């Protein structure tokens, strides 16, 4: 009987960015989306390296770490199976279901040094690849005669176990602002005072009129909720010339992704896993 009815309205979308504007819901929903995106939407990334000839200057466990953090395309992530489940395997090598292996090999045999980048990781499922963006993520540098040869086993995980496996470079929201200027107290101020009210705003929300020379909010979106314009007013005397307070439905969310999962399908994928969560806590009867 009681049920909110949220309503989205996207403003920019790309494969990495997305700025949608939810209206009509409680913050407790948006926070939940944030939180779950940051740390449940699953992704696939490397999780057991096995090295056979390191000759480089960097030790083995600094090659491992570095490898894991590399972002690996994982559209298939939600359909795999956390290894700890899959009982179709001993946990080694490709298992269509749970793991995908990535051999890498390099040895410098010239003079000028060879950057073992990431475009040199080759895989065997042609789905899980490394994400391409213009040259890739140096994993080591090798000088003549030095060699690296490794075989790795990717797996699927949730970013609450390590952040190798987390698909977001910051998701965040801003209670959209509501600004009301008293417009008659603001007639009291002399021109100068105004132009020292304008320019006490850290960002730029406010702005003078060409003509009437009145403060005219000119971008409500950019108001970090500092208290500066307000407190300058108090000091100038006139209190409450400007009062600015959160609207407490409208949010403006901004998701950005590591590239593993497109932005779109990060959000949709969150909503989906939330449902699957909720629908496990029903107490039946």
């Amino acid at each position: 009987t009681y049920q909110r009815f949220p309503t989205v309205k996207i403003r920019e979308l790309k494969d990495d960015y997305a700025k949608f504007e939810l209206r009509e819901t409680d913050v407790s929903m948006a926070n939940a989306l944030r939180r779950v995106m940051i740390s449940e939407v699953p992704t696939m990334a490397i999780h057991l390296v096995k090295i056979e000839v390191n000759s480089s200057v960097l030790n083995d466990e600094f090659i491992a770490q570095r490898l894991s953090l590399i972002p690996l395309t994982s559209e298939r992530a939600m359909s795999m199976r956390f290894c700890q489940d899959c009982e179709d395997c001993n946990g080694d090598e490709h298992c269509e279901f749970c793991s995908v292996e990535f051999p890498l090999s390099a040895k410098c045999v010239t003079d000028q040094t060879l950057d073992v980048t990431s475009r040199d990781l080759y895989s065997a499922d042609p789905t899980v690849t490394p994400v391409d963006f213009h040259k890739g993520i140096i994993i080591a540098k090798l000088r003549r005669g030095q060699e690296l040869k490794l075989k790795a086993l990717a797996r699927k995980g949730i970013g609450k176990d390590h952040a190798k496996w987390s698909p977001a470079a910051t998701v965040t929201y801003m209670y959209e602002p509501d600004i009301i200027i008293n417009e008659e107290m603001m007639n009291t101020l002399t021109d100068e005072e105004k132009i020292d009210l304008i320019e006490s705003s850290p960002t730029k929300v406010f702005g003078i009129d060409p003509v009437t020379g009145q403060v005219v909010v000119v971008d409500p979106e950019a108001y970090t909720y500092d208290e500066e314009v307000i407190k300058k007013a108090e000091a100038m005397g006139k209190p409450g010339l400007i009062e600015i307070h959160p609207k407490h439905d409208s949010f403006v969310f901004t998701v950005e992704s590591t590239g593993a999962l497109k932005a779109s399908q990060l959000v949709l994928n969150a909503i989906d896993i939330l449902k699957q969560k909720l629908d496990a806590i029903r107490l039946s009867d």
Binding site: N90, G91, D92
Partner: protein, 44 residues
């Protein structure tokens, strides 16, 4: 069953696919934990 010094694999568990070496009671290739597990949980 097996013998001292063998290289086996942890089939099922939180530590799956890890390779380990059987001190007597297996020991992992690069971590300091000495775990003990039955034969059903170990593979070549």
């Amino acid at each position: 069953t097996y013998s001292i010094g063998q290289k086996l694999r942890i089939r099922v568990g939180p530590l799956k696919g890890y390779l380990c070496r059987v001190i007597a009671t297996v020991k992992l290739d690069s971590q300091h934990k000495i775990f003990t597990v039955k034969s059903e949980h170990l593979a070549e």
